[PDB]
Design a protein around this ligand. Structure first.
Ligand SMILES: NC(=O)C1=CN([C@@H]2O[C@H](COP(=O)(O)OP(=O)(O)OC[C@H]3O[C@@H](n4cnc5c(N)ncnc54)[C@H](O)[C@@H]3O)[C@@H](O)[C@H]2O)C=CC1
Ligand SMILES: Cc1cc2nc3c(=O)[nH]c(=O)nc-3n(C[C@H](O)[C@H](O)[C@H](O)COP(=O)(O)O)c2cc1C
Ligand code: SF4
Ligand code: SF4
Ligand code: SF4
Ligand code: SF4
Ligand code: SF4
Ligand code: FES
Ligand code: FES
Lengths: 120, 156, 226, 225, 439
């Protein structure tokens, strides 16, 4: 959701991202880049993610010929599935309305009562 | 849109004569509009605000603060059953169940013909003669569930 | 004037209240509804401190520091256990209806409600029931509206009406269903409506121009300009 | 006459216990990745020889620091706009060591003479239209009206007409009339202004095509297009 | 019950057919004689001091001295604009005294407001009446018209040069409007949020002017004092509270009603000798002395004189002195759930503890009703009782809201603990994350 918690929790400062929004109101990263020539693979970004989006995976084979190609962008990081956390969805928790989830449709959320309602 | 009639406007000005601040007549202005039209529509807020000389946010806040000023359309008759503690002891719940069974509606909504709107209400000040109900201007006491269809048929 | 906060003597102005006097001395008291430019109304009930009748008093009573004057010879305690529990309880009551919205909220890292939640020491939720929801309005191209995040601190209506003399923003409803905003969707008509983004301690009124290309406060490069 | 601008802010050699003034917060993020799309080699930190500030977090932003220029308000435990409480000597008052900026001139010991040039009354002359300025908080300022977020907030361009003047011109509200100023016949829609005095047309100053130099000037051949 | 003017100053004029008493019948039964005495032979300060040493306390439910409240109006002569407000709201569940007072004796209230406005030098008076007392509003307007026709109201009353205009402000149905500062705000046409005191309404009340707010029963007690003298009033009863209070007993009793009794009358005297005891098949379980806002008391407290001090030291409040009886058939948790639902929906929303903690108590009691309670719920209820006490909220709505909850926990804890069945659970399991099993 491009909340920038992983970028500030990084002690190296090797996460850069910008928040974009869809027409239905869903936050997402416009870009997401990680300098893997700088990353110490400490997992503080995964520890700081409130949506469990960023995840350190059991894979070490990452050697590169040029240092410029160690800057992974969003096309090199975004995978086709949920990874190590298979069921968590942040937008079900959140009270912000996005596509397919209106006000009062989140978990532990009541339906919105208008102030013009006849009930006391 | 909305237009205030001559009688409503005249009554509102006569109410404004009774106070040293015209803002004090907002509750009675909303009551006048509700008495004439059954409820307070959205244009009535701006008409009352223009008449009294106060902002429409103040009028809307007043109309939404009080529970007896209706900002949604209601039925022709407003049933208000008391659900307070003394009427809870005297058995308001059987009366409420009879009202649901006869009207086929939950509290807070209107029947299919727009005849009745059922509403829970605060203590009606008639606790020694409970349980109590209040249709539009008439209060009924000593309620029994067998008397609810007899009471509701006399309001057309 | 002379006050004694937790056994420490301070010289203050007797024409000020205890909240502004203690904040001027660097002492930390949580507060929502009081603003330096608006005054004290005693709404959020958050600024509670324990006041004693004299030096040789142990019982005391919980009073609002924003509503209590900083008169001479005034004995108060901020770090008292009962006052701390009451302030944490106020934050806990505000946290019952608050949406799980901090990552997708433009006030994150700039939020006064977050600061006062952390300062009171409240991080455990024993509330297991539902949270109330509100629909948003369209306030124009500058102010974004998100009424789920409101804590009913009444700062917006106080500033917009009693300070800025605006007419198109108010408070509606009653009990816990209090709604803050315009009677209908439309642009906020005041010329000083953008100060709501800093008057609001939560993320209800936010900068839409900043929300288009958003980044958090720690990620900014600031300069003092004119 | 501009000798006071030296004391508006201290010079570039000003330090707080030896270090400069931080522009960005201490928790500034993405230093090794915000420019990695261009070059993986991190560039040199920009140098600020003009001011006492630095283009990095390597500086001072303490609320008790002896300065008057505060780039942003942050105290530990106060990440909100309420950190200005920590940055003030008393809350809602002045800054801890004085507000920045100085007055260029003091109040003079002697006053001025009375302006005996009293103007005559406005006489509405036929065939000429006096231009009354209308100012907009969204549109009159040039740089502000260049902003794309103002374009929805800018009013649509107009010409204000008195009801008597509009009746004389035979135009209702909304219809488009043309008027020529320095050989530029520009057409605008009519808005009826009851409070505007007769013999005047109202124009939105600072807009696109309507300069603020037009205020107080006259108009010719105003007629319905 | 034999009703004499000396023993029953308020209800001795009541008709047997429950019909209202209009101007001719009221004046035949010694009406407006106290008003005549006060307006002709007495100074306003003399009447204020007379009411002050009569011991007339406020019958609205707080028991403040009415004469002391009258004396706190400023002595400044630039403030010649003054307001007298009659709190005819009566929105407390279990309170029906002012409905009886205004539906059948509106001229008593009119005379009392006339005397009190002469005493307070109040040029205007407003009867803030609720919107559901239609008959009381009709009778009050008719009595005001009758008194205006006979010269008891309007300009130059009784040739004394005193002008008093009395209006009837019909409410729009909120329980917070009975609070006197919220009453002032609702009279001003605003949202009925209360105001912080000091300043009190005596110094700056309605529209910033001096303003005195008094209940219907206090202003009904006033003309008896001004007609029969102070010495008659002090020797009505040998108790610390002077005069007669309208005390009743309601809720599944044989004769629910309302009777004018001297102070110090025991509650068992009201429940048995006047209400006829409980109905057949019902055993007495608890009672509330003065309405919904007061604490529950047990059958051991029935032998207690109904005074402010005696019920105060027993862990409750005298209140409106209209007791309500709870029998064994009614569950205590259901009753407290109903009370808290009323108190939470009648919150004005101004201040955080009531507005955001009364719904929490409502949800907890709803869970305890259907047996969905969890450990820590009763501890949470006790914490809400402690933290919603006097001085912790902006007004006294929430102390009255948490009085029945704390008393029912104190006396009927076995019913509350019977609703706790499931273990506590606030979280759900998230796959891939090990929970922190706190101890
Ligand atoms: N329908 C009813 O009759 C209801 C009655 N109540 C009762 O209302 C009471 C709570 O009401 P409050 O207004 O909070 O009571 P309170 O004790 O704060 O004040 C009551 C009266 O005393 C006056 N007063 C008190 N202290 C004063 C001072 N220091 N200086 C000047 N005037 C002073 C106030 O102006 C007011 O007229 C409770 O006893 C409750 O039982 C509550 C709900 C409904
Ligand atoms: C929440 C709340 C509601 C109240 N409602 C009423 C009411 O409906 N009628 C009334 O006379 N007093 C009510 N009071 C008490 C008033 O504050 C005040 O005591 C009364 O208007 C006048 O006081 P008196 O008894 O000395 O005449 C209420 C108090 C509170 C806190
Ligand atoms: S694992 Fe790498 S990217 Fe993540 S916080 Fe640590 S150094 Fe930064
Ligand atoms: S990866 Fe997680 S922590 Fe980082 S910006 Fe996205 S949602 Fe926030
Ligand atoms: S307003 Fe504050 S507490 Fe609420 S979601 Fe936004 S950042 Fe979080
Ligand atoms: S919208 Fe913001 S400023 Fe207004 S009451 Fe709610 S939290 Fe306070
Ligand atoms: S306790 Fe607070 S929110 Fe509740 S009614 Fe009183 S002022 Fe309003
Ligand atoms: S409790 Fe129902 S009328 Fe009072
Ligand atoms: S800051 Fe004092 S109660 Fe809000």
């Amino acid at each position: 959701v491009a909340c920038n918690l992983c970028a500030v929790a990084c002690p190296v400062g090797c996460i850069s991202l910008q928040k974009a929004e869809t027409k239905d109101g869903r936050w997402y990263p416009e870009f997401f880049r990680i300098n893997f020539s700088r990353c110490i693979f400490c997992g503080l970004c995964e520890e700081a993610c409130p949506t469990t989006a960023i995840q350190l995976t059991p894979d070490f084979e990452m050697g590169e010929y040029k240092r410029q190609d160690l800057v992974y962008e969003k096309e090199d990081l975004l995978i086709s599935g949920p990874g190590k956390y298979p069921e968590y969805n942040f937008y079900r928790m959140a009270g912000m309305a996005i596509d397919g989830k209106d006000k009062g449709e989140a978990e532990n959320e009541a339906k919105p009562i208008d102030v013009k309602s006849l009930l006391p | 849109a909305f237009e205030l009639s001559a009688a409503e406007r005249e009554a509102i000005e006569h109410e404004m004569h009774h106070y040293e601040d015209p803002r004090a007549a907002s509750i009675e202005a909303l009551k006048i509009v509700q008495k004439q039209r059954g409820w307070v529509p959205d244009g009535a807020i701006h008409a009352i605000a223009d008449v009294l000389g106060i902002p429409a946010s103040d009028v809307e806040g007043v109309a939404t603060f009080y529970s007896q000023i209706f900002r949604q359309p209601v039925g022709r008759h407003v049933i208000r059953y008391c659900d307070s503690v003394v009427c809870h002891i005297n058995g308001y719940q059987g009366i409420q169940a009879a009202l649901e069974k006869k009207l086929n509606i939950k509290p807070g909504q209107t029947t299919f013909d727009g005849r009745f709107t059922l509403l829970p209400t605060c203590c009606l000040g008639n606790c020694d003669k409970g349980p109590n109900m209040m249709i539009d201007e008439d209060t009924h006491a000593h309620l029994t569930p067998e008397a609810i269809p007899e009471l509701l048929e006399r309001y057309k | 004037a002379t006050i004694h906060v937790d056994g420490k003597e301070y010289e203050v102005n007797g024409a000020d209240n205890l909240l502004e006097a203690c904040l001027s001395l660097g002492l930390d008291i949580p507060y929502f509804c009081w603003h330096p430019a608006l005054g004290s109304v005693g709404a959020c009930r958050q600024c509670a401190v324990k006041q004693y009748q004299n030096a040789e008093d142990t019982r005391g009573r919980l009073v609002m520091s924003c509503m209590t004057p900083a008169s001479d010879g005034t004995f108060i305690s901020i770090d008292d256990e009962e006052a701390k529990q009451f302030r944490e309880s106020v934050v806990e009551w505000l946290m019952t209806n608050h949406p799980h919205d901090c990552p997708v909220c433009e006030e994150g890292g700039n939020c006064h409600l977050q600061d006062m939640t952390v300062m009171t020491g409240h991080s455990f939720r024993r509330y297991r029931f539902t949270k109330r929801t509100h629909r948003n309005q369209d306030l124009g191209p500058f102010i974004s509206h998100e009424m789920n995040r409101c804590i009913a601190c009444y700062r917006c209506v106080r500033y917009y009406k009693d300070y800025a003399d605006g007419t198109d923003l108010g408070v509606y409803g009653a009990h816990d269903n209090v709604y803050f905003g315009r009677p209908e969707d439309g642009t906020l008509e005041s010329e000083f409506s953008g100060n709501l983004v800093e008057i609001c301690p939560t993320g209800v009124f936010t900068d839409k121009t900043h929300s288009e290309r958003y980044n958090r406060k720690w990620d900014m490069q600031f300069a003092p300009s004119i | 006459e501009l000798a006071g601008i030296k004391d508006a802010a201290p010079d570039a050699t000003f330090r707080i216990r030896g270090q400069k003034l931080a522009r960005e917060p201490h928790r500034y993020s993405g230093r090794t990745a915000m420019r990695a799309n261009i070059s993986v080699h991190e560039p040199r930190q920009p140098q600020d020889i003009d001011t006492m500030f630095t283009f990095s977090m390597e500086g001072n932003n303490q609320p008790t620091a002896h300065r008057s220029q505060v780039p942003f308000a942050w105290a530990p435990g106060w990440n909100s706009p309420q950190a200005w409480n920590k940055f003030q000597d008393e809350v809602g008052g002045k800054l801890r060591f004085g507000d920045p900026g100085v007055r260029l001139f003091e109040t003079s010991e002697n006053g001025l003479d009375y302006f005996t040039s009293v103007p005559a009354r406005f006489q509405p002359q036929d065939g000429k239209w006096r231009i009354a300025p209308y100012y907009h908080l969204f549109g009159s300022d040039e740089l502000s009206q260049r902003a794309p977020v103002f374009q929805s907030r800018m009013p649509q361009p107009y010409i204000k007409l008195n009801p008597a003047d509009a009746a004389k011109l035979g135009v209702n509200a909304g219809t488009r009339v043309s008027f020529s100023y320095d050989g530029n016949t520009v057409t605008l829609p009519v808005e009826i202004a009851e409070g505007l005095t007769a013999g005047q047309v109202g124009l939105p100053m600072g807009m696109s095509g309507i300069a603020p130099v037009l205020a107080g000037a006259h108009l010719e051949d105003l007629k319905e297009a | 019950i034999i009703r004499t003017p000396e023993t029953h100053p308020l209800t001795w004029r009541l008709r047997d057919d429950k019909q209202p008493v209009w101007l001719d019948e009221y004046r035949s039964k010694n009406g407006y004689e106290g008003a005549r005495k006060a307006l002709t032979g007495l100074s306003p300060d003399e009447i204020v001091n007379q009411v002050k040493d009569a011991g007339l306390k406020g019958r609205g439910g707080a028991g403040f001295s009415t004469g002391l409240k009258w004396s706190l109006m400023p002595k400044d002569e630039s403030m010649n604009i003054r307001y007298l407000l009659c709190n005819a709201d009566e929105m407390e569940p279990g309170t029906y005294k002012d409905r009886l007072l205004m539906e059948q004796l509106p001229h008593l209230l009119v005379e009392g407001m006339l005397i009190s406005a002469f005493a307070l030098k109040a040029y205007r008076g407003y009867i803030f009446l609720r919107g559901e007392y239609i008959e009381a509003a009709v009778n009050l307007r008719r009595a005001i018209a009758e008194a205006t026709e006979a010269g008891l109201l309007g300009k130059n009353i009784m040739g004394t040069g005193f002008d008093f205009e009395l209006f009837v402000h019909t409410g729009a149905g909120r329980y917070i409007c009975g609070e006197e500062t919220a009453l002032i705000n609702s009279l001003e046409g605003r949202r009925a949020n209360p105001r912080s005191k000091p300043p009190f309404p005596a110094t700056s009340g309605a529209w910033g002017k001096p303003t005195c707010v008094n209940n219907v029963e206090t202003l009904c007690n006033v003309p008896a004092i001004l007609a029969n003298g102070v010495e008659w009033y002090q020797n009505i009863s040998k108790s610390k509270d002077a005069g007669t209070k309208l005390m009743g007993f309601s809720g599944r009793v044989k004769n629910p009603g309302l009777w004018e009794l001297p102070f110090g009358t025991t509650a068992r005297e009201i429940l048995e000798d006047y209400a006829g005891g409980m109905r057949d098949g019902l055993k007495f379980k608890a009672w509330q002395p003065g309405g919904a806002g007061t604490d529950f008391l047990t059958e051991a407290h029935l032998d207690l004189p109904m005074e402010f001090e005696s019920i105060g030291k027993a862990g409750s409040r005298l209140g409106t002195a209209l007791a309500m009886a709870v029998d064994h058939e009614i569950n205590m948790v259901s009753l407290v759930r109903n009370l808290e639902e009323f108190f939470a929906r009648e919150s004005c929303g101004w201040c955080t503890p009531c507005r955001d903690g009364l719904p929490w108590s409502v949800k907890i009691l709803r869970a305890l009703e259907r047996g969905e309670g969890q450990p820590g719920d009763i501890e949470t209820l006790e914490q809400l009782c402690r933290f919603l006490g006097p001085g912790k909220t902006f007004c006294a709505h929430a102390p009255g809201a948490v009085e029945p909850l704390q008393s029912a926990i104190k006396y009927f804890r076995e019913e509350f603990e019977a609703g706790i069945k499931q273990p506590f659970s606030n979280t759900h399991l998230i796959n891939g994350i090990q929970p922190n099993l706190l101890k």
